[PDB]
Amino acid sequence: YTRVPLCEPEELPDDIQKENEYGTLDSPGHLYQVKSRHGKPLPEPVVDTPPYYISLLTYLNYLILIILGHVHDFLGMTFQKNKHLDLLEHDGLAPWFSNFESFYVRRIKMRIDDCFSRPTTGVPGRFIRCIDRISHNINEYFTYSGAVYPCMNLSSYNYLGFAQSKGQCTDAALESVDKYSIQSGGPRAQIGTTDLHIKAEKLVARFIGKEDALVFSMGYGTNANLFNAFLDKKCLVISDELNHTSIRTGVRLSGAAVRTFKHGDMVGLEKLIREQIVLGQPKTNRPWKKILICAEGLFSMEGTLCNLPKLVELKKKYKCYLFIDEAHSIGAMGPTGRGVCEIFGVDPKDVDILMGTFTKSFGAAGGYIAADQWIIDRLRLDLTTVSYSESMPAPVLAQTISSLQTISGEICPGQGTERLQRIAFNSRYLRLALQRLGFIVYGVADSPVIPLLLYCPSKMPAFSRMMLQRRIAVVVVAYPATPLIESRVRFCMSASLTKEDIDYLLRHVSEVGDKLNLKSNSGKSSYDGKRQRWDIEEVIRRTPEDCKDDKYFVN
């Protein structure tokens, strides 16, 4: 009962399974093509704020929580010690972790821990199956029963619907298993490399648009073990305040000086560049050996794009280097799927180093780096992962190659464009409908991530539980991951969902938000400068036609 059950697969006809994993389009009018911005720079984004009493209530709630938590800790650890034997010294040995460094997890998040780490089963397609559990004590231990129910999926990194068990990719993987075993001999330097590795590298280099590229087994290791190859203690790195932990770990391992600039502020970046060029190294004032700029394509927590032409002209003027991450932008953004470079029209030659990950769109696990010839030739000899780690397995390579070929158009014609049009239309329709209802939605017009703000801390468990009761899966984040005032729910859209599912979600979300009083719009979201409190039927009737027009989006 305490252990997680092993679920026996169910027997169903083929068509039901295909419909479960991937939906079938009803009308050809639910597709949209993405245009390219030639000479239109990105305008400064505009954000909306709620009234003051929300902030005051949030501050009071957090103050009460902190006071009672500290009082409980002190009284409990002073008046008794038998129960708290994991946080005190025993037989002259220090405890594993500290009391103060883990206050939040034990005192605030533990009471709402049922919303995290939810076990599932089956393919993570349109409908995801979940295993039920019963909370005991206060989210201390759980008891499981043999019952599984489906839920609508809005919490998985599946943009183009490549997570399927019936298709060309699965057959390719099975054939690869038949030919190549799952065994990997060792590091790529010794025995690991085969012909499929070269084929995948060449195909990736052709697809991205650069000269050559390499492949890796883990996305985290691509960043964690890269910067020490060509950086040292006499170089400067300028990075945004919002970057993934892998980049920070890699820079920390490298040892270079780090200076950060505020998100979406180019003037501060220019001032910092000028000051750092003038001043030089600390305590000696010698010039910097080189300067590197780090940035990310699409930011997942906000769904905003980076300004690429500004960075390109700044690096050309001041003789700097550029590094771009495209985890959330490859294969899902642009008229074809090349990335932000195709959106802005910037030639890929300008960017020195490009990176990507196959998990978010192509339904595999790995990463890549794309650069010029001599840079790659040197890095191959100077890298650590190549001659010290394992090698990529064959089924993952087969899946990635099949997905890239399908998206390019060599095989299975008329599929990639249809998927891209589906995802674009779904994202635009959902964002426009949510803004028309009266909520607060962040991001650019076409971004698969839709963050909805839920300010008061007590409104996250209620919303999550009510949505789960109505068979919709959601993900909620809070402090310290997000700012204290702003806590949000993230929506991940797919190309497998259908307009009927969106209508169902819209109805349920609207009624739940009306129940919980989550509608706070100040009129800056509307393009006509007026408050929008519409009806669900009117929105459903009018939005799909007006979703295609670009004049209804402020940004």
Partner: protein, 177 residues
Amino acid sequence: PVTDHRRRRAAAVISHVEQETFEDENDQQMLPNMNATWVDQRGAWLIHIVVIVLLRLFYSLFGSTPKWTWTLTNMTYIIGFYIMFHLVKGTPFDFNGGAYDNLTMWEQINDETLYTPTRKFLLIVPIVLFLISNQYYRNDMTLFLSNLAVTVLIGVVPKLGITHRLRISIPGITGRA
């Protein structure tokens, strides 16, 4: 030792926290602190007035004399602010490796900048509160002296250009560098 990463506990009547080395300062303080960034945000300045008003109303609901009510509200506000800001040392979540284990939240505000508008406001509030409050208990000299002592010794001396990174070993051997 090949790294030489140790914490010192030198004992003296007057001592100061040593300046951070290159690795600890120029490299291990790069990401947002997430412990002092919320100060310069929305609604972070009226909340003190709201707290003062709520305390005064809560004490007045009891039905006591104005003198005791105002003395108690002044003492409670000042003691609470001191406990929150000046007493505790560190951060509730691991930052990089324990880089901020020798400084309080007051020192961490605005990246150790001495004079910022929020600091000016935080210093101004106690003085104005004292001037507003003293008008009810001017007759009693003992209460006036007690209020003045509390304000000066708790709400004025710590928020000064001096007594920055200042530690006294009288109540315990403090740790510097």
